[PDB]
Amino acid sequence: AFQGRKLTDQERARVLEFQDSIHYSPRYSDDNYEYRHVMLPKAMLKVIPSDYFNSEVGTLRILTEDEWRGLGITQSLGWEHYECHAPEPHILLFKRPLNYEAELRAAIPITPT
């Protein structure tokens, strides 16, 4: 049940070619959040589909977790994409709470009575 605008098999192939060139900053923290930023190759920006930018700035819009994992951006559980200042568009900011427990929860089905 994809949240957000899933890429097509065609978009996805085009974006996933840049996956090995994405850079991930060290994490830093304040009183409530850990932060990190992800830096995309400028060339990847060219094949990121048009609806993923917001026409106003030139920056990426807020991405859902499914959306940005969709782009090849690979990091651990808990990270939220948030809107920054107006940096270069190829820098994406992420945060997650310090009080993060990172579980894996799956409902499992039984036969009804």
Side-chain angles (χ1 to χ4, degrees), residues 27-73:
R27 303 178 283 157
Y28 56 102
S29 73
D30 54 31
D31 287 341
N32 300 112
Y33 287 94
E34 288 180 328
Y35 304 87
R36 97 115 57 70
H37 51 261
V38 175
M39 309 183 57
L40 315 183
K42 287 172 188 272
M44 175 178 169
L45 277 175
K46 286 190 176 67
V47 307
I48 290 188
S50 174
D51 51 320
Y52 271 62
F53 296 85
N54 53 338
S55 38
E56 337 290 334
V57 197
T59 51
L60 293 175
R61 58 171 177 89
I62 302 305
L63 301 188
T64 60
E65 179 161 16
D66 289 335
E67 268 161 357
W68 59 256
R69 309 199 92 113
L71 292 177
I73 301 173

Side-chain angles (χ1 to χ4, degrees), residues 1-2 7 10 14-15 22 27 33 38 40 42 55 57 61 64 72 75 77-78 83-85 87 94-95 104-105 111:
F2 196 108
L7 302 185
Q10 184 58 54
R14 196 95 148 75
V15 176
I22 301 189
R27 303 178 283 157
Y33 287 94
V38 175
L40 315 183
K42 287 172 188 272
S55 38
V57 197
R61 58 171 177 89
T64 60
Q75 52 192 358
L77 298 184
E83 202 92 60
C84 32
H85 54 289
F94 290 91
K95 63 180 166 66
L104 201 77
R105 304 161 83 168
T111 302

Side-chain angles (χ1 to χ4, degrees), residues 78-108:
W79 291 108
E80 319 180 16
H81 182 217
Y82 70 101
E83 202 92 60
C84 32
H85 54 289
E88 294 255 32
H90 66 280
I91 292 98
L92 292 74
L93 308 203
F94 290 91
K95 63 180 166 66
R96 81 149 92 98
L98 288 169
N99 61 282
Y100 199 71
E101 281 233 329
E103 63 198 340
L104 201 77
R105 304 161 83 168
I108 67 191

